[PDB]
């Protein structure tokens, strides 16, 4: 049984939040 469109969008949104946290860590490590 395949995944739904909503599951892919959920994963992409959680990854976008994780990427925001990553940018935050990278900027903190920089300065």
């Amino acid at each position: 049984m395949p995944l739904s469109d909503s599951q892919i969008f959920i994963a992409l949104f959680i990854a976008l939040l994780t990427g925001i946290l990553a940018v935050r860590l990278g900027l903190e490590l920089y300065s």
């Binding site: 395949p2 995944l3 469109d5 599951q7 892919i8 969008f9």
Partner: protein, 33 residues
């Protein structure tokens, strides 16, 4: 696959748009006096 249009959007984004932005911004950062 579900949402099968997504590769046709994200592959140009990650392969062309993001690298162009990245090298333009990084060029501007590393040449800044």
């Amino acid at each position: 696959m579900a949402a099968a249009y997504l590769p046709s959007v994200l592959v140009p984004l990650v392969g062309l748009v993001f690298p162009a932005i990245a090298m333009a911004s990084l060029f501007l950062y590393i040449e800044k006096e």
